[PDB]
From a paper:
Herein, we identified from a library of lipases/esterases/acyltransferases and variants thereof a lipase originating from Sphingomonas sp. HXN-200 (SpL) able to form amides in aqueous solution starting from a broad scope of sterically demanding heteroaromatic ethyl esters as well as aliphatic amines, reaching isolated yields up to 99% on preparative scale and space time yields of up to 864 g L–1 d–1; thus, in selected cases, the amide was formed within minutes. SpL is a hormone-sensitive lipase-like (HSL-like) protein adopting the alpha-beta hydrolase fold, with a helical lid domain over the active site cavity with the catalytic triad. The common Ser-His-Asp catalytic triad was located at positions Ser159, His281, and Asp251. Mutational and structural studies revealed that an aspartate next to the catalytically active serine is highly beneficial for the observed activity, which has not been described before, showing that a catalytic tetrad is actually required (Asp-Ser-His-Asp) for SpL for efficient amide formation in aqueous buffer.
Diffraction data were collected under cryo-conditions from native crystals, as well as from crystals soaked with benzylamine 2a or the amide N-benzyl-2-pyridinecarboxamide 3a,a leading to data sets with resolutions of 2.0, 1.6, and 1.8 Å, respectively. In the complex with benzylamine, three benzylamine molecules (ABN1–3) could be placed into the electron density in the active site. ABN3 was located in the nucleophile channel and adopts a position from which a nucleophilic attack on an assumed enzyme-acyl intermediate can be facilitated and is therefore considered at the catalytically relevant nucleophile position. Next to Ser159 of the catalytically active triad, an aspartate (Asp158) caught our attention as it is not present, e.g., in the lipase from C. antarctica B (CalB). Thus, a carboxylic acid moiety next to the serine at the binding site of the amine in the structure seems highly beneficial for amide formation. As Asp158 in SpL seemed to be of high relevance for efficient amide formation, and putatively the negative charge of Asp158 is important to set the microscopic electrostatic environment at this position in favor of amide formation, we hypothesize that its carboxylate moiety may support deprotonation of the positively charged protonated amine substrate in buffer, which cannot act as a nucleophile. By ensuring deprotonation of the aminium species, the amine becomes available as a nucleophile, which can then attack the acyl-enzyme intermediate following the classical lipase mechanism.
Numbering used by the authors:
A (entry chain A), B (entry chain B): 6 to 314
The structure:
Amino acid sequence: THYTRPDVAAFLAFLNAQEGPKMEEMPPAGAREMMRVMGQLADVPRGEIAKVEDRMIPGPDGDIPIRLYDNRPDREAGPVMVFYHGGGWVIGDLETHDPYCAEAARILDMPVIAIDYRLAPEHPFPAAPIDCEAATRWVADNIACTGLVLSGDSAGGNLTIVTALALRDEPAAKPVIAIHPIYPAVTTHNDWQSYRDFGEGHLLTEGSMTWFGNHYAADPADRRAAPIDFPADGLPPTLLITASLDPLRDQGRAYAAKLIEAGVPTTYREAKGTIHGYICLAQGIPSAKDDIRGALTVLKAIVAEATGA
Amino acid sequence: THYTRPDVAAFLAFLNAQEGPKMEEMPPAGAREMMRVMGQLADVPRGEIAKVEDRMIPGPDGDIPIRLYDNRPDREAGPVMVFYHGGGWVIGDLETHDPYCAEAARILDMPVIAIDYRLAPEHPFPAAPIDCEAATRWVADNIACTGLVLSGDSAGGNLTIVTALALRDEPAAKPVIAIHPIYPAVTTHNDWQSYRDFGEGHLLTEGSMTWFGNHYAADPADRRAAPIDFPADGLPPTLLITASLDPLRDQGRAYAAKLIEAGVPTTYREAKGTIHGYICLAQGIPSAKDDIRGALTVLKAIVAEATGA
Ligand SMILES: NCc1ccccc1
Ligand SMILES: NCc1ccccc1
Ligand SMILES: NCc1ccccc1
Ligand SMILES: NCc1ccccc1
Ligand SMILES: NCc1ccccc1
Ligand SMILES: NCc1ccccc1
Ligand SMILES: NCc1ccccc1
Ligand SMILES: NCc1ccccc1
Ligand SMILES: NCc1ccccc1
Ligand SMILES: NCc1ccccc1
Ligand SMILES: NCc1ccccc1
Ligand SMILES: NCc1ccccc1
């Protein structure tokens, strides 16, 4: 039917055989625990890294936790990545995406600063965008860097694009030199062939998407929810990656196409035969390691071209 | 106004001051000579390269001249680039694009084979696509290689895409690994904002485009003229570059967007503040050297990822 990598199909079959409630049948605290446990079982470890540090920074509606990863702390000032995790604006935290952030720091050879932004339903829309924009501006002001590289997965891919638009309109202390949205959401609408094709049996389901969206309570007319409905001109060079079996695939394609139509230099990658969520499934789906390394190698080159110009 | 690099504006002012007939006021033989002279004055030299060889190959209508460039002739079999020069399907030859082809061979560290395909009006459409396809199949059958990288500028960027579509539908003896259309034409129509904005004073003009089109006499309904009107699914990884002051810019953007909407892995670059034809203007417009190097560095990486998988 649809091209599926053998290791991905193996993982889906393992998923399907598990007993216990679906995420959508759980309170937020249970869902949060489910994702932590899934990462413990199906993601790789942090691995060796020179420096990881946690602190709190000021934010407009309270303090924001952030985590710095750096495998070469005696570096000269250069690019810094600011990372927003996924989790449907409800789940995920600094631990769920810790393996990926450490790997990104190692491959990219830049510091990675992960943001622990406020989550729904305790803090509904627009808390996540507000925190992500404030933390990103804080990094520009307070960290030695020459420019910012924004990135994140899923909900965090949404936040990447939203925050890049915010900084385009009102620059931070340092420019955004590149962005890397990973299987992002860019609209609330579901009128996509990929949604029809992959909205069941591929981890991110119609059920889970409804559950997340009901808790987040986004305004579908606000650019901070639905950036595809707003001009993309003047955004930084973009690396956008989708997964081929992902309900969100077609909207990601559409956003990348929109960037190109606005003259934004754009690299589009599609992880063929894998699913939404792969960046935190690198033990369960070993091929994810190649998707991660592939994309980050290309991002490192985009950033090098920017810093060499 | 429109963003123009200072060195580009300098070159346009020099162009504007030149006396003598416009290309479109000339017979084809005169236009051909004009382009050769322009390259002698405004392009860099071939430079040092280990091997350049000429031969004839058997094409459908007679001998097709080809030229092989290789800076490492003792190499093991690997990818080979097949290059189709531009010139509006009327002008250009193996000398007009010789500096670029030698530079491509040096940077890519692969052999480059340039094709001297049949030109209009002596040989109208579809002679050029026929020759380009036949020569590409010849290379796959007769040159030691593992796969093909197709590339070309302007009319040659059209021929890149058309040839890749033909080989998708009926594979050659070696797969097409990647394609690199450079400021391509992908349709016969002129309903584009970039055409209205840059159709005068930026080298490729409304007048020259009409003159080329009239000689080539393409069928606007045929995929070998207007690839944008036909499915792009299943094409190889694509690096498409445009120039920001080019009448063809918007159709190039549109074709790259179409590739992404078909799931083709696509790298889109836009040479900001420069014109159509820059790859043969690297002495007149020194910044063209950076546009050339930047694209070929990216292409080298695309090919390495393909061949490493
Ligand atoms: N050195 C600033 C910092 C510390 C910890 C986490 C993020 C940023
Ligand atoms: N984007 C976080 C996620 C992954 C898989 C399933 C649901 C949510
Ligand atoms: N961020 C995961 C997601 C996508 C679409 C709708 C709801 C949740
Ligand atoms: N339906 C949830 C959602 C919210 C914001 C952006 C995309 C999707
Ligand atoms: N130093 C490059 C340059 C030349 C002319 C005008 C502006 C800039
Ligand atoms: N001719 C170089 C230059 C351009 C602008 C301002 C100062 C110097
Ligand atoms: N020295 C004459 C000149 C300089 C730059 C571009 C065109 C012509
Ligand atoms: N006689 C060798 C050769 C091969 C390809 C192109 C030119 C020459
Ligand atoms: N292929 C357009 C063109 C015309 C004249 C000189 C250079 C380039
Ligand atoms: N109008 C000239 C032309 C011919 C073929 C393809 C594109 C443009
Ligand atoms: N290949 C140069 C060109 C483009 C469009 C129309 C005519 C010629
Ligand atoms: N960049 C000076 C120049 C202008 C025209 C032709 C050759 C060189």
